[PDB]
Write a structure and sequence with these properties.
The complex is a heterotetramer, with 2 copies of chain A and 2 copies of chain B. Chain A has helices at 9-22, 42-48, 50-57, 75-87, 97-107, 110-123; strands at 4-5, 29-33, 36-40, 66-68, 89-90. By secondary structure, chain A is of the alpha+beta class. The chains are: A alpha+beta, B little secondary structure. The complex binds the ligand N#Cc1c(Cl)ncnc1Nc1ccc2c(c1)CC(=O)N2 (2 copies) and chloride ion (4 copies). One ligand A1AB9 sits between chains C (46-50, 53, 108-110) and A (16, 19-20). Chains A, C: It is found in: Nucleus. Chains A, C: Residues 27-94 form the BTB domain.
Chain lengths: 124, 4, 124, 4
């Protein structure tokens, strides 16, 4: 086609989706990770995670307002990945890398798994 | 705006 | 903070949101523009348009599944802007520029209004 | 990945 493109558009959309999340506006699911709860938008979760994409395209699970993650999942690891989904920013630190990598593998977030593997390999 |  | 950032993340999220729209997955509103209907995600509309941001933060309108636009709004102009919201790509042409600009003014999409004004000024 |  003969389209023009606004470079910052995708980043501006994501910033606004994060602002809606922070104000709990039109959030339609709560992700339960052991004792912790995280409110989010199903569409953002699906757009970022192979696991959520599978869950919310399921004819029964698409209608659930609560999703319980595997008890082995670390809430802080999930929190870091949820923030990444809404911001493109990953708070990767020596103290959380193992939990973040395990959570990203479970959530099927290949690019996060990739950088975790690379950061781990550099430290050995 | 750019030509993509 | 000491975060790392994935450059293509925002673009990949938007591509997936557009894929969900094309397959009518978790779309929660229909925008009626005279004889035409457009299914979309309320959160994407709010993230792109000052008018939809106002509409879906309203305590009554947030719950509506159908939104009827002003009868003066051109469906093709709306279609072009809806595609832009989900892709960052604007199909701006001599034959549609006036309709696109009027629709963008109504929808409160300042960056689109700006490029329409600039393209019009260059042709006079 | 980059340093933002
Ligand atoms: N929403 C949506 C969606 C669609 Cl529509 N099409 C294709 N993938 C989608 N999302 C999704 C699927 C698999 C993975 C990711 C996202 C990140 C990753 O590492 N794996
Ligand atoms: N969703 C959301 C949203 C939030 Cl949370 N905060 C601030 N603006 C939001 N969206 C929005 C408001 C005004 C305009 C646009 C988008 C594009 C434009 O030209 N005007
Ligand atoms: Cl439920
Ligand atoms: Cl990822
Ligand atoms: Cl309704
Ligand atoms: Cl805009």
């Amino acid at each position: 086609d003969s389209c023009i493109q606004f470079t910052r558009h995708a980043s501006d959309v994501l910033l606004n989706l994060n602002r809606l999340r922070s104000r709990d506006i039109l959030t339609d699911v709560v992700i339960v990770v052991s004792r912790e709860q995280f409110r989010a938008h199903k569409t953002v979760l699906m757009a970022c995670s192979g696991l959520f994409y599978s869950i919310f395209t399921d004819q029964l699970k698409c209608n659930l307002s609560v999703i319980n993650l595997d008890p082995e999942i670390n809430p802080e690891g999930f929190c870091i990945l949820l923030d990444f989904m809404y911001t493109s920013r990953l708070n990767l630190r020596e103290g959380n890398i193992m939990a973040v990598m395990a959570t990203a593998m479970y959530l099927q977030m290949e690019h996060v798994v990739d950088t975790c593997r690379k950061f781990i390999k550099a430290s050995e | 705006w750019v030509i993509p």
